[PDB]
């Protein structure tokens, strides 16, 4: 079950997964192009690994009561991929599923 | 329960507790011998109170 | 009589809180409601 999203050039992309956090969370954001290997973007809600520019950012886990949102400052035509939300919670136990994919489409 | 499931607890200073217990063992030796071994054990039983 | 289930999923304390549901009296004394509440382990017996 994949949900679509249309973001044009110039503005930002705000991707938020549907899985809610029942406590302290540590989500993982991925990027998987069809045919290419998946790329890790965000781990521990703020950290970017080696090979990620200053384009993506995640919401930290401070003053719980908020949601998880992956903001993208700068849309690129090569970002026609799926963005997953691997939600790890303290009360949901072990998470074996990746959740759902948000197929971001770019216009123009 | 809005948040994490955690356990209630209490904290005391370990440096202050040895300093405080070091004075009680000094005053306890006035009613007993000078070279006696004074131990401290936990509770033996009863109800939870 | 209560119907208590556990709250914590990841076992290690698993079993401190109990999610008990029971039949409570309504303000009109000819109907009954099915309400739930959280109780500690020291307040419930089997």
């Amino acid at each position, epitope marked *: 079950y994949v949900r679509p999203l249309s973001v044009a050039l110039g503005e930002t992309a705000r991707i938020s997964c549907g899985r809610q956090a029942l406590g302290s969370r540590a989500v993982q954001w*991925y990027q998987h192009r069809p045919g290419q290997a998946p790329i890790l973007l965000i781990y521990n809600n703020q950290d970017r690994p080696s090979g990620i520019p200053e384009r993506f950012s995640g919401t930290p886990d401070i003053n719980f009561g908020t949601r998880a949102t992956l903001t993208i400052s700068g849309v690129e035509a090569g970002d026609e991929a799926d963005y997953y939300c691997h939600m*790890w*919670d303290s009360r949901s136990g072990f998470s074996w599923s*990746f959740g759902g994919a948000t197929r971001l489409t770019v216009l123009g | 329960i809005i948040g*994490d499931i*955690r356990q209630a607890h209490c904290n005391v200073s370990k440096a202050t507790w040895n300093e405080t217990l070091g004075k009680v063992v000094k005053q306890l030796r006035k009613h007993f011998g000078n070279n006696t071994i004074i131990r401290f054990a936990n509770s033996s039983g009863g109800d939870l109170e | 009589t209560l119907q208590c289930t556990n709250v914590t999923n990841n076992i290690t304390m698993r079993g401190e809180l109990k999610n008990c549901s029971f039949n409570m009296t309504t303000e009109l004394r000819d109907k009954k409601q099915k309400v739930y509440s959280l109780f500690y382990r020291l307040d419930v017996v089997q």
Partner: nanobody
Amino acid sequence: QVQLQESGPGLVKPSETLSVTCSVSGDSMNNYYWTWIRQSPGKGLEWIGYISDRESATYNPSLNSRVVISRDTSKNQLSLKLNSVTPADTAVYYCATARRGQRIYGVVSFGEFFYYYSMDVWGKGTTVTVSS
């Protein structure tokens, strides 16, 4: 710097064994976790299990433990063993690593923490097709 590259058989018959071998070079298996990721066309990514360093193998409970994996240092090769292949594995496999991250939210002495795994580096992978 760790590089991953795997090769599969490509063809597989129904009700037959399955073996996909992944070759990894660049570094040893001292602190590197390993896992197997599956993705079928029409759905998302599917995690099936992982292997630890002390040979403690756990798998996805949604598959009822139909697979078993192993790895050794003398050959530097990790593989997968699957029996009674249901004809629904028209998918592509991925050979990726994992990192054991500890998320502490409460008192450490009371066990108020949970472990989370993140896949740092991935592999190219190959696909399999079950044909009659």
